[PDB]
């Protein structure tokens, strides 16, 4: 009973806070998650992680890699990196935050002129999307060398 | 944890809270 | 507890006992005395897919609603093996999402059934009842209940 009441009320409040808050500053949301993660059930944690991943994927899809360089996608996705799911964080996945970041980096590399300089956040994006072991699962080196 | 959270079987069906006066009456 | 109550009063048409008229205090007292045997249901939306037309549609479709009756089939003629691989039964052609339930097959019988014979179109919805029965007996007829969401001035907010 307490678990389900906490699930309903607290997860609804956390989802409302996630919808209301700005994506570019996830430090207060991460602090709330760290503080309330002791009493948070697994279902509420999974739903909150799904909402956060949806907000991050929406921000990554909506932000223009060539134009909207003020809000760094790497710095925005850094705060939710440890709590992100494996499916979203997998660079080899067809859909996900990491897949969208890799596709945006490839598009920026393809449509990037030498006069504008290097792409901001590409170093941390390649650090996130570079597998430690496995040549077939490394999506950083091949996309970079092809774009 | 995420699998049990997203599992339609594992995401439990909920029920409402108890009555404290009824619990005290049951104890008495 | 009279045998034919109110038969000599102006509350009935006459000794043939055929038409009655009762006052509001009398009707309220009878409702309170009949409290163990009166329906609590106020919303007509309570019986969505649990009323006669839904039961008849489920009977014609040879399906059973949750909690409802079950009958002999109306049509024991269609088997998919009779509906063998002509055009439509291609599992490689049908996109499978999460499955459609019996309640949905009954709620929309012409969309979700290939041969919807003898099915009945049930009432779709009613406006939701926002009436709640007051428990506190000292409360007046008209009062802002705690169950009602409050109206704020900035919730109204004429902007421009």
């Amino acid at each position: 009973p307490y678990e389900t009441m906490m699930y309903e009320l607290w997860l609804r409040t956390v989802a409302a806070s996630v919808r209301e808050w700005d994506v570019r500053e996830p430090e207060p949301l991460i602090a709330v998650l760290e503080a309330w993660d002791a009493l948070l059930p697994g279902f509420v944690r999974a739903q909150l992680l799904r909402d956060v991943v949806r907000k991050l994927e929406e921000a990554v899809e909506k932000w223009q890699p060539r134009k909207h360089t003020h809000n760094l996608p790497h710095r925005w996705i850094f705060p939710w990196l440890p709590y992100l799911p494996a499916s979203h964080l997998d660079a080899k996945a067809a859909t996900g935050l990491v897949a969208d970041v890799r596709r945006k980096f490839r598009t920026l590399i393809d449509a990037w002129d030498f006069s504008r300089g290097v792409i901001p956040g590409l170093k941390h994006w390649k650090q996130v999307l570079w597998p430690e072991h496995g040549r077939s699962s490394d999506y950083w080196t091949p996309l970079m060398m092809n774009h | 944890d995420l699998y049990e959270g997203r599992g339609p079987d594992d995401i439990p069906r909920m029920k409402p809270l108890p009555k404290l006066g009824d619990v005290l009456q049951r104890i008495r | 507890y009279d045998h034919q109550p109110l038969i000599d009063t102006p509350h009935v048409n006459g000794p043939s006992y055929k038409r009655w008229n009762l006052t509001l205090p009398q009707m309220a007292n009878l409702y309170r005395l009949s409290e163990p045997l009166v329906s609590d249901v106020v919303d007509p939306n309570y019986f969505y897919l649990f009323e006669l037309k839904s039961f008849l549609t489920a009977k014609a479709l040879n399906v059973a609603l949750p909690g409802g009756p079950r009958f002999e089939p109306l049509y024991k003629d269609i088997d998919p093996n009779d509906e063998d691989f002509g055009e439509f039964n291609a599992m490689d052609r049908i996109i499978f999402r999460n499955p459609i339930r019996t309640e949905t097959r009954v709620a929309y019988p012409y969309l979700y059934n290939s041969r919807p014979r003898s099915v009945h179109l049930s009432w779709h919805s009613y406006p939701q009842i926002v009436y709640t029965k007051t428990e506190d007996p000292e409360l007046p007829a008209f009062y802002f209940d705690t169950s009602i969401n409050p109206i704020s001035s900035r919730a109204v907010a004429p902007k421009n």
Binding site: E8, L11, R12, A15, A16, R19, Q47, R50, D51, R54, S87, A94, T95, R103, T107, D110, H147 | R6, P8, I11 | D43, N45, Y46, Y48, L49, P66, F88, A90, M91, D92, R93, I94, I95, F96, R97, N98, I100, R101, E103, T104, Y108, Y110, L111, N113, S114, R115, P116, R117, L121, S125, Q128, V130, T132, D145, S147, I148, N149, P150, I151, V156
Partner: protein, 337 residues
Amino acid sequence: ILGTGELYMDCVLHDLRKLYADMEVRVSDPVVRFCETVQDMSATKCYAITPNKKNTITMAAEPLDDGIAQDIESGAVKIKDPPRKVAKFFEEKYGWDKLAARSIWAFGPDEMGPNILQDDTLPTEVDKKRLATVKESIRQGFAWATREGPLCEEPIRNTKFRLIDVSLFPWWWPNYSDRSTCLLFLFLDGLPRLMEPMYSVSMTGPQSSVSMVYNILSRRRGHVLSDGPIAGTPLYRVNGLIPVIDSFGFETDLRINTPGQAMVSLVFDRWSIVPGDPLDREQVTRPLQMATAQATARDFVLKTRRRKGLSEDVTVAKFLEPEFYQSLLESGTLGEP
């Protein structure tokens, strides 16, 4: 038959069986009308040579910016508006170059369609009168080709085309399938994606009902945009988003599962990107089985192709000239067939 929703198509199929045709009609499982788009700009400047080897067309494709498709569908700009006003609108609103905004030729598939065609060609290299005649040919050929699209023969949205230089246009062209074909291969080089329609969900009901709405949308791949009380009532209104293909049965499931009474409206809202890459040959879906989160676009496009009767896979060889096909296969821009 394409219609608005479950009740709409129930009424339509009732009127078909009992009112107009007066017979028994076999009806499939409901599905959605898809769309197509691109998410990366074209890397290879693709060219095509006529069957008589007179004319050559060189171009590239690009995703459009946010808001152009919705503004052109609403009618902020028109193909019959003055070109100076059209160029002024694009330059002012989207930060577009004056030359490009004046060089925008075509809206596709129709006057208010969501695809645009612009020539980045130089007048120093292309003569305008031949460019005018082949431009009208490209008008109607691009219009013919953009209804189909390469993935599942479903119309394509949110696309920009740039006709690049060097492409020379001698007189007279009666064939259309050739630059249709290079538009299709240009989409493949642009690495396309599939788009599904979205219903905006809006329910009204009590608080047990809003909890159940969150649960059922979580199962059905939707999410709650907004959630509030209705002032002066004991009701709560919850707005959200769901795909149509996952919303089949959503209203009935919600109404039979909520302990209160929830009332649901499902309206068409927008087109959104389906999860997954449609061209990923790795992703395999079992028959009779729910598509995974990564294989969803692939599963949709294969079953759409097999439903329409097309080939089992996208044919780059059919979508290319053999010479440029072999050249790009040697260069490694395209994958292994």
